[PDB]
């Protein structure tokens, strides 16, 4: 009984991901998001610890949804004739990091450090759960404005994490690494680090560095804003052309630009209220 247990509200968005509605769980008035996915528009399918065939996105959300984290939690889901419906957490108030950066411009490094740190913890969490997001970008990050917590969303391009080569990809091309542009192959962690380099430049400069394949494989990074040397070093390291030259997640979080990070509550109080 789906329609008679969540009160459906206004459309939050639609696109290559589906159609996401605001909603309230009638049981306890909890804010929820209700996401619809047309069955015909699904590429990768999986099965859970029940054998029921479901979209990979549901598989991945279940693997990461255990406990608290900087990942959006899947509360429930239903099957319909031609669609699947996903019940997800909805922070309130909320704004995604793409709109936040558009409105504010290039973020102060203190704020970019707190945001980037939380994204690193969230991505580490996914990899710990055997999940590879494959579409890390500002558009897929929610800001709980009151708590100052970042939430990773939209696993519709993800895969189970593995150590062999990936030769398929349906994420955002401007956040994809040069080895995907040049050779249609990549490894999961090193490609994730590349997208995180794109993300960090986006935070400190006000937009992404590369728009075109030539720029991506060119691996030249021009800074259009005043950015500290330590932060430019971390960005250029993440965006090394050779995947093996990129830093590990440990090396990113041990980098000197990443020290003395603000707490989420401090980040809200200083930068978001």
């Amino acid at each position: 009984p789906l329609e008679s247990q969540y009160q459906v509200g206004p459309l939050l968005g639609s696109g290559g991901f589906g159609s996401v509605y605001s909603g309230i769980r009638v049981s306890d008035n909890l804010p929820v998001a209700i996401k619809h996915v047309e069955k015909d528009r699904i590429s990768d399918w999986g099965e859970l610890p029940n054998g029921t065939r479901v979209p990979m996105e549901v598989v991945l959300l279940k693997k990461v949804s255990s406990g608290f984290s900087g990942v959006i939690r899947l509360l429930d889901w239903f099957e319909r004739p031609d669609s699947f419906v996903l019940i997800l957490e909805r922070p309130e108030p909320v704004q995604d990091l793409f709109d936040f950066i558009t409105e504010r411009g290039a973020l102060q490094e203190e704020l970019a450090r707190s945001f980037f740190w939380q994204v690193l913890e969230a991505v580490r969490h996914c990899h710990n759960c055997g999940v590879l997001h494959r579409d890390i970008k500002d558009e897929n990050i929610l800001i709980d404005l009151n708590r100052g917590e970042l939430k990773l969303i939209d696993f519709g391009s993800g895969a189970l994490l593995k150590d062999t080569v990936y030769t398929d990809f349906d994420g955002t091309r401007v956040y994809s690494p040069p080895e995907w542009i040049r050779y249609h192959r990549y490894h999961g962690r090193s490609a994730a680090v590349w997208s995180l380099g794109i993300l960090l430049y986006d935070m400190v400069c006000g937009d992404i560095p590369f728009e075109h394949d030539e720029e991506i494989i060119g691996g030249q990074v021009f800074f259009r804003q005043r950015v500290s040397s330590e932060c430019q070093h971390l960005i250029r390291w993440c965006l090394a052309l050779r995947p093996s030259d990129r830093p590990t997640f440990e090396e990113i979080q041990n980098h000197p630009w990443m020290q003395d990070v603000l707490l989420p509550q401090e980040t809200a109080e200083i930068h978001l209220h």
Binding site: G15, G16, F98, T102, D135, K137, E139, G156, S157, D170, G171, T172, R173, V174, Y175, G206, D207
Partner: peptide, 8 residues
């Protein structure tokens, strides 16, 4: 200059 979203 113009800043835009990018689909997938």
């Amino acid at each position: 200059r113009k800043r835009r979203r990018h689909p997938s």
